[PDB]
């Protein structure tokens with residue numbers, strides 16, 4: 001689902017100005033301010049966000065297009081390393097991730113991941129690991145972000161400040177609501193609630209992930225075409241049936257400056273197609289944050305936007 005935000009430029013540039021200019025220096029205060037400003041989001045946008053937050057969508061994502069973003073010459077050089085300087089001045093797409101983010105839930109940091117930071121810069125880096133956001137030339141295989149983590153976030157948000165030079169990088173998303181109808185009764189019943197072995201990403205280096213779970217008439221999805229490792233042949237067969245159904249419903253989003261993609265991390269699996277970086281200081285640059293909500297026990301109380309959580313594998 002897409003929402004053209006172009007006409008909100010002015011109002012959104014305003015709300016963004018309400019926020020502290022050095023977010024990481026005091027993230028709790030920054031996010032709190034963004035929560036206040038979030039109450040003033042244009043009615044239409046606010047409704048779309050609230051509706052998507054409560055109902056999700058058939059395609060499992062909400063793309064906000066045309067959000068304000070700095071002219072390319074006004075953006076810093078594309079980052080060449082992580083973590084980002086705590087002193088880095090606020091970027092507009094980051095502001096948008098704050099506003100829209102608090103409208104949906106709580107930004108959450110994951111200790112063992114990216115120094116336990118909350119705002120993640122997603123740019124390509126030399127000799128990147130195959131399962132990393134830093135890859136470019138190699139396809140970033142379908143994955144439900146941290147599906148093996150107990151505190152898996154409900155949403156993964158990606159805001160684009162800089163697309164790749166030839167704009168060939170495509171963000172893929174496959175929705176459980178479109179793929180499920182393609183599986184037969186046997187396969188669904190086999191998948192639903194069946195915990196299966198799953199490795200974890202490098203930073204968290206078992207875990208038992210349930211490919212499907214929840215209401216059988218509208219189950220959530222936990223899939224990783226890399227770390228999900230089924231045992232029983234019956235199992236492997238059901239997963240493959242799901243892997244194919246997902247490929248079959250694959251949707252492609254080409255992120256361009258001003259774009260903010262909200263991935264329903266409980267009903268989708270995503271990926272990124274190949275692209276060649278130029279190492280010229282203007283490579284692809286996305287901003288990522290994870291959002292937690294009241295849904296399916298991600299919160300136990302007392303949580304605040306900006307909190308960093310430890311790792312506990314599902315099982």
Ligand SMILES: NCC[C@@H](O)[C@@H](C(=O)O)N1CCC1=O
Nearest residue numbers: 131132133143146201202203
């Ligand atoms: N398919 C792996 C996802 C990749 O993006 C990675 C990272 O940030 O390097 N990541 C997010 C959580 C985690 O380990």
Ligand SMILES: O=C(O)CCC(=O)C(=O)O
Nearest residue numbers: 122133171270271272288
């Ligand atoms: O580069 C992209 O568009 C997607 C990267 C990704 O999978 C992620 O940051 O979770």
Ligand SMILES: [Fe+2]
Nearest residue numbers: 143145156270
């Ligand atoms: Fe991802």
